[PDB]
Amino acid sequence: LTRNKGPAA
Amino acid sequence: NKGPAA
Amino acid sequence: EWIPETLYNTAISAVVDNYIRSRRDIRSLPENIQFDVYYKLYQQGRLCQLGSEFCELEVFAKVLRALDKRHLLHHCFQALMDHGVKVASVLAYSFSRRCSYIAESDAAVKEKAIQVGFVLGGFLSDAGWYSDAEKVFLSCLQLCTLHDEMLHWFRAVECCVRLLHVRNGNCKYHLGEETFKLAQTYMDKLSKHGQQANKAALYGELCALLFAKSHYDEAYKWCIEAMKEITAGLPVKVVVDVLRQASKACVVKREFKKAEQLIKHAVYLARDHFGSKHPKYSDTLLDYGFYLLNVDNICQSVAIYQAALDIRQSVFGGKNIHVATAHEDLAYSSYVHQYSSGKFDNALFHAERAIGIITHILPEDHLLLASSKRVKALILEEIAIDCHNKETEQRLLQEAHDLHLSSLQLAKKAFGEFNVQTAKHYGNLGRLYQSMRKFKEAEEMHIKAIQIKEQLLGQEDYEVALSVGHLASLYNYDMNQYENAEKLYLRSIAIGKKLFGEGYSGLEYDYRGLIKLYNSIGNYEKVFEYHNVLSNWNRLRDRQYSVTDALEDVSTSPQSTEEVVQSFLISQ
Amino acid sequence: EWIPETLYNTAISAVVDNYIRSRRDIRSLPENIQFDVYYKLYQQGRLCQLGSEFCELEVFAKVLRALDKRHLLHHCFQALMDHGVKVASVLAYSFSRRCSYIAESDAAVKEKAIQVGFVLGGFLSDAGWYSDAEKVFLSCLQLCTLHDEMLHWFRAVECCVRLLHVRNGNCKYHLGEETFKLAQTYMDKLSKHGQQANKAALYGELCALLFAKSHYDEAYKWCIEAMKEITAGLPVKVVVDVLRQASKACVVKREFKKAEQLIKHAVYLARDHFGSKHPKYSDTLLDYGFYLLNVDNICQSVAIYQAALDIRQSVFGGKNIHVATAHEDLAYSSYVHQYSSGKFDNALFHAERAIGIITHILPEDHLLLASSKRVKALILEEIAIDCHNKETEQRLLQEAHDLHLSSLQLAKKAFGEFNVQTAKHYGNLGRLYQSMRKFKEAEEMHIKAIQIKEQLLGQEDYEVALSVGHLASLYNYDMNQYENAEKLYLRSIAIGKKLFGEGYSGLEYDYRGLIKLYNSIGNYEKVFEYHNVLSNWNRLRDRQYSVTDALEDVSTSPQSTEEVVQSFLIS
Ligand SMILES: [Zn+2]
Ligand SMILES: [Zn+2]
């Protein structure tokens, strides 16, 4: 899990 | 269930 | 037990089986029997004997009069629209012709046509067919403007407020401003004559329009003005719409305590009046899921969305834009919730259905596709990195690239260069380029995202924090710019502490990033310090995140109307 | 960064390496100097030279006055008791020998002996050697009853409060009643001569003696009596000892609200004055964890015992009776925590240590073995069920069958037939006989366990409800008379939700019993309902079960010393 989650949808 | 309290 | 069927249900099955011969005399039945015959035709699967009857506007007018069985009419209508017959377009075109014909008639016939148009447009916009709902509301508005009587002014205001809800759901934002200008002109000349109409519904639709356009500050201002215009005499539909839109507007302004009670009261009002299986209740649960998905509440947001989807999957199921919106919103929520484990079989499935429905009932260059093509893409890259075949890795990365580029172009054409949505597209492109080993322009994408996010949302905001966290993860892991990563990581953790406290999900990611940052520069005491902080954070996540189903957390009989709105107003 | 050794510490190692030549003149050193010489001998491992001088009462008298480094004396004293030489036994005998020599002497020399007796007797009571602390206290009690003066009865009552404490931990309950009656002789005599002696600690010791003999009605009566006479001027060790043993009487009285406000303040008050690594602090946690064990705070009940054992292990060396009792509670806590999982790996090891420590230091007929061997037998019972090999099962059940009756006989001799503990073993034997396939004997044991435990406790008690569940679980499987278990199971759920709510661990095996009972007769209108009950059971307790220990739960206490006392007393 290199990155954070997506901004939004 | 498990047993009496000591 | 095996109770026999009533004579009513047995007579229905004796008329349907002789439908083709007595189709003329059925149209003379009472309005509460005509629906039962048509619903039986739907149940038997004789949709073509039924679609041949719903296409006429006069027959569909009496079917709409049965408000008790509207939850069955929505299912029947949605079963017609994916059957192949375009009932939504035919009814709208027929109503437009009949309005253009009886525009010259007296006031009573025009008023009857306006009422028929209001109920038909409310049904079509309720069923999601927005593009076929303008042609009804536009015809009603045209009927309104002909005569300058007072009720015509008020019903022109009603046409404008209902038509504005259609265009916001149809993502025709550029016409929403003009519709609001027309509505406010009508209400200004209404107030000129000494009477004031209720401004709550119109200002709530403005809140929805500006939040969809990502004008968060003006959305907050307009939801303030909306909730300043809420009285007890308003219909509960208008009231719950205003509260849910204001709850969405409060979250983007980072005022969650107000949004908490707002969305709780909205869900309570939706459950109390409409029911647990109503489309408006499903909309309120969608907004509740958005609220929970924002403030750290992810293990229950999926459960909220699953309840929200299951209502829309039952009231009107199949290929519909509302079911597609529920799938898309759940898929991103399932993407966030299931992100820690790494599996994405279910989330990709719920994202693909949202893709496979919008592409069937909307044009390929529509904004609602853009809000969905991101989510699948946000899943694909996550499936891409966790895969092992390199060809599969590259193919899914390029597919996500195509989806993000199409969504970015749609958002840029719709809103513009300087907006939050375009910045989110830029951040998605940046993290994808990080995933695609193209780190040179990944920094450019991330800095372009942050300079737009922080300009509109301020130096301290959730989207800004997430974007700078992505930039820091890019710097410290792959571009080896360790000095620049420290300040960005500190900014991310600071904004997380200010907004969400110490329970934020991304704090784990940025703490692991800081661990890898300090391991490279050999500062082992900072490694130990942030390792202790990470263990404390994990304990905290294991402490105040208990199993509390949000469908029950809304409780029963909480602070009712004229109380939540008043507390929210005085809390400003 | 290579800090040079202090000349104090450097000179310590300078005389330890030359101990033999300067052995005589080390005893002439100051007490602060003298202790560090001896503590260095233990650190170097020269226990034989360390034990070469603690066997003298006079040398051990000066060492006992190092109050700050008492936690190091306990760790050295236990090291000698594992080293060989019985320094506890010789010191007690040597003190008792010299004590009788000043009976005809003046009270000036005499009063020094009681002061020596209380610090030495208190230390051995702290160190756990109750069999040797009793001989110390009985000697100093004799001096206080020779010359009739107002101060002599003021300390004779101070012997009997501590005599009754070294006989509660030594399981000499039969002689405990006589000491209390002997205490009232001097206590009433002092009261007549214009001195109302404080009946707080002395009444507080019956809160454990009568609790040990399962006299819950009498213990709770003396729980109220002991709690009234508390005073802010009392020593903190005296105060915390009352709260611990008063809280225990409330747990068995099926009262939970007033118990937690007492014992949490006992934890808070002990941690404040003493610290987080003091023997008195660990003594509070075991009593505190007894509360968590009975309120279904099972997740942190193991941790609080694990925390309690680590405190004693860091201070009480190796083979010490206090470590075994700390081992005892942790062994049983893991027994009920790992019941569903079956991971009785550390549960047996703690139980095996509990047998190992006690058998070395206590006689084979001591009652503490009966308490200790009971839990290990419960470990062996569940292990044989989980094991796949039937040859292993038939041997381990018999080994557990060996321990219960040996434990039961010791309970029968000291407590009488009509007591909870004797009926407690009857409940264990009934469950044991279910695994032993002696179903007819299991029926006899269960009815014995339910006609005796319920007879004196009452119709509504926690342990009585479990005893019903043991026999309710019988009729479900072996006897197959489901009508008998239909009324028995209905009693198990009934008492379960009165205090523990729906989400109780024993109720899971009770709701499942009703479905299993209903599944045999084909009933299904309740099986579907009770399947929803399990779904409610599976969530509601786990909704409020999130990880949270108890040391930060108590934290700082807004409640003061008086805020807890009056609240419990008026209610
Ligand atoms: Zn058809
Ligand atoms: Zn030796």
| DSSP structural state of residue D363 | -
How many whole angstroms separate alpha carbon D361 and alpha carbon D352? 15
Give the pair of three-digit tokens for residue C74. Answer: 């929505």
Q: Which of D294, D431, D507 sits opposite B3 (nearest CB)?
A: D431
| DSSP structural state of residue D558 | S
| DSSP structural state of residue D478 | I
With the CA atoms of D393, D397, D398 and D399 taken in that order, what torsion angle do they form, in degrees rounded to the nearest 10?
Answer: 100
How many whole angstroms separate alpha carbon C516 and alpha carbon C271? 48
**Whole-Å CA distances, C465 to C481, C538, D35, D45:** 19, 20, 60, 59
**Whole-Å CA distances, C193 to C107, C148, C180:** 21, 12, 20
How many whole angstroms separate alpha carbon D322 and alpha carbon C159? 84
How many whole angstroms separate alpha carbon C478 and alpha carbon C342? 21
Strands (E), D215-354: none
How many whole angstroms separate alpha carbon C368 and alpha carbon C359? 9
Give the pair of three-digit tokens for residue D467. Answer: 């005893």
Binding partners of A (≥3 Cβ pairs within 8 A): C
Number of Cβ within 10 Å of residue D178's Cβ equals 14
| Yes or no, beta carbons of B2 and D505 under 8 Å apart | yes
Give the pair of three-digit tokens for residue D27. Answer: 């005893």
- Burial annotation D125-146 (CB, 10 A radius, 16+ → b, else e): bbbbbbbbbbbbbbbbbebbee
* Shortest CA gap C304–chain D (Å): 17
Local structure of B2: helix, strand or coil? coil
C-alpha angle D51/D57/D63, rounded to 5°?
A: 70
Query: What distance lies between CA D568 and its chain's CA centroid?
Result: 23
| Yes or no, beta carbons of C371 and A9 under 8 Å apart | yes
- Which ligand neighbours the alpha carbon of C51 most closely? 1
The residue type at C89: S
How many whole angstroms separate alpha carbon C164 and alpha carbon D26? 99
Contacts of D312 (CB under 8 A, 6+ apart): D279, D282, D320, D322, D323, D326
How many whole angstroms separate alpha carbon D510 and alpha carbon D493? 7
Number of Cβ within 10 Å of residue C231's Cβ equals 11
C-alpha angle D108/D113/D114, rounded to 5°?
A: 100
Number of Cβ within 10 Å of residue C438's Cβ equals 12
Discontinuities after residues in chain A (C–N over 2.5 A): none
Contacts of C538 (CB under 8 A, 6+ apart): C508
> In this structure, are residues D305 and D333 in contact, taking their beta carbons and an 8 Å threshold?
yes
Number of Cβ within 10 Å of residue C188's Cβ equals 9
Q: Name the packing angle between helices C107-127 and C150-169 (round to 10°).
A: 20
> In this structure, are residues D393 and D387 in contact, taking their beta carbons and an 8 Å threshold?
yes
* Shortest CA gap A6–chain C (Å): 7
- C552 reaches D (C-beta below 8 A): no
Resolution of the experimental structure, in angstroms:
3.5
Number of Cβ within 10 Å of residue C7's Cβ equals 9
> In this structure, are residues B1 and D338 in contact, taking their beta carbons and an 8 Å threshold?
no
How many whole angstroms separate alpha carbon C90 and alpha carbon C292? 40
Give the pair of three-digit tokens for residue C530. Answer: 């942030």
How many whole angstroms separate alpha carbon C105 and alpha carbon C213? 40
**Whole-Å CA distances, D384 to D33, D381, D430:** 56, 6, 16
- Which ligand neighbours the alpha carbon of D84 most closely? 2
* Shortest CA gap C470–chain A (Å): 6
> In this structure, are residues D403 and D380 in contact, taking their beta carbons and an 8 Å threshold?
yes
The residue type at C537: W
- Which ligand neighbours the alpha carbon of D51 most closely? 2
Contacts of C73 (CB under 8 A, 6+ apart): C35, C39, C63, C64, C66, C123
The CA D82 to ligand 2 mean position distance, Å, reads 10
How many whole angstroms separate alpha carbon D501 and alpha carbon D12? 61
Provide the phi-psi class of D436: left if phi over 0, else alpha when psi is between -120 and 50, else beta.
alpha
C-alpha angle C140/C143/C146, rounded to 5°?
A: 150
How many whole angstroms separate alpha carbon C413 and alpha carbon C411? 5
Number of Cβ within 10 Å of residue D417's Cβ equals 10
DSSP per position, C389-431: -HHHHHHHHHHHHHHHHHHHHHHHHHT-SSSHHHHHHHHHHHH
Give the pair of three-digit tokens for residue C255. Answer: 């005022």
> In this structure, are residues C435 and C446 in contact, taking their beta carbons and an 8 Å threshold?
no
CA neighbor of C433 nearest in space, from C424, C442, C425: C442
Give the pair of three-digit tokens for residue C210. Answer: 């500006």
- C547 reaches D (C-beta below 8 A): yes
Query: What distance lies between CA D447 and its chain's CA centroid?
Result: 29
CA neighbor of C450 nearest in space, from C432, C439, C466, C431: C466
For residue D84, what is the enclosing H or E element? none
- C92 reaches A (C-beta below 8 A): no
> In this structure, are residues C321 and C362 in contact, taking their beta carbons and an 8 Å threshold?
yes
> In this structure, are residues C222 and C264 in contact, taking their beta carbons and an 8 Å threshold?
no
How many whole angstroms separate alpha carbon D524 and alpha carbon D522? 6
For residue B5, list chain D residues with Cβ-Cβ distance below 8 A: 293-294, 462-463, 466
Per-state percent for chain B, helix, strand, coil, to nearest 5 = 0, 0, 100
CA neighbor of C87 nearest in space, from C31, C36, C42: C42
With CA atoms as reference, the chain B residue closest to D330 would be B6
**Whole-Å CA distances, C182 to C150, C176, C245, D78:** 16, 10, 21, 92
How many whole angstroms separate alpha carbon D514 and alpha carbon D521? 11
**Touch test D–B: 3 Cβ pairs or more under 8 Å:** yes
How many whole angstroms separate alpha carbon D204 and alpha carbon D457? 22
Experimental method: cryo-EM
CA neighbor of D338 nearest in space, from C539, B3, C543, B6: B3
How many whole angstroms separate alpha carbon D117 and alpha carbon D98? 11
With the CA atoms of D212, D218, D224 and D227 taken in that order, what torsion angle do they form, in degrees rounded to the nearest 10?
Answer: -30
| DSSP structural state of residue D513 | H
- Which ligand neighbours the alpha carbon of D42 most closely? 2
Cα dihedral across residues D166, D167, D168, D171: positive or negative: positive
Query: What distance lies between CA D309 and its chain's CA centroid?
Result: 11
For residue A5, list chain C residues with Cβ-Cβ distance below 8 A: 335-336, 339, 466, 505-506
- D392 reaches C (C-beta below 8 A): no
* Shortest CA gap D507–chain B (Å): 8
Binding partners of B (≥3 Cβ pairs within 8 A): D
- D508 reaches B (C-beta below 8 A): yes
| Yes or no, beta carbons of D543 and C547 under 8 Å apart | yes
With the CA atoms of C374, C376, C377 and C383 taken in that order, what torsion angle do they form, in degrees rounded to the nearest 10?
Answer: 150
**Whole-Å CA distances, C523 to C517, C519, D1:** 9, 6, 18
**Can you list the alpha helix ranges (DSSP code H) found in C341-366?**
345-361
How many whole angstroms separate alpha carbon D488 and alpha carbon D510? 10
> In this structure, are residues D117 and D92 in contact, taking their beta carbons and an 8 Å threshold?
no
How many whole angstroms separate alpha carbon D448 and alpha carbon D431? 12
How many whole angstroms separate alpha carbon D210 and alpha carbon D249? 9
DSSP per position, C82-122: TTT--HHHHHHHHHHHHHHHHTTS-HHHHHHHHHHHHHHHH
- Give the count of alpha carbons within 13 A of D21, CB side only: 4
C44 phi and psi angles, rounded to 5 deg: -70, -10
C-alpha angle C512/C514/C519, rounded to 5°?
A: 95
* Shortest CA gap D220–chain B (Å): 19
| Yes or no, beta carbons of C342 and A6 under 8 Å apart | no
Give the pair of three-digit tokens for residue C302. Answer: 């999926």
Q: Name the packing angle between helices C57-64 and C87-102 (round to 10°).
A: 100
Q: Which of B1, B4, B6 sits opposite D505 (nearest CB)?
A: B1
For residue C543, list chain D residues with Cβ-Cβ distance below 8 A: 546-548
Local structure of D55: helix, strand or coil? coil
How many whole angstroms separate alpha carbon C107 and alpha carbon C111? 6
Number of Cβ within 10 Å of residue C151's Cβ equals 12
How many whole angstroms separate alpha carbon D11 and alpha carbon C242? 83
| Yes or no, beta carbons of C547 and D547 under 8 Å apart | no
With CA atoms as reference, the chain A residue closest to C512 would be A2
Q: Which of C335, C372, C509 sits opposite A3 (nearest CB)?
A: C509
Number of Cβ within 10 Å of residue D52's Cβ equals 15
| DSSP structural state of residue D352 | H
- Give the count of alpha carbons within 13 A of C530, CB side only: 21
Give the pair of three-digit tokens for residue D503. Answer: 């989400």
CA neighbor of C405 nearest in space, from C383, C429, C423, C435: C429
How many whole angstroms separate alpha carbon C267 and alpha carbon C282? 9
- Give the count of alpha carbons within 13 A of D15, CB side only: 19
How many whole angstroms separate alpha carbon D32 and alpha carbon D509? 60
- D395 reaches C (C-beta below 8 A): no
Distance linking the first and last C-alpha atoms of chain C: 61
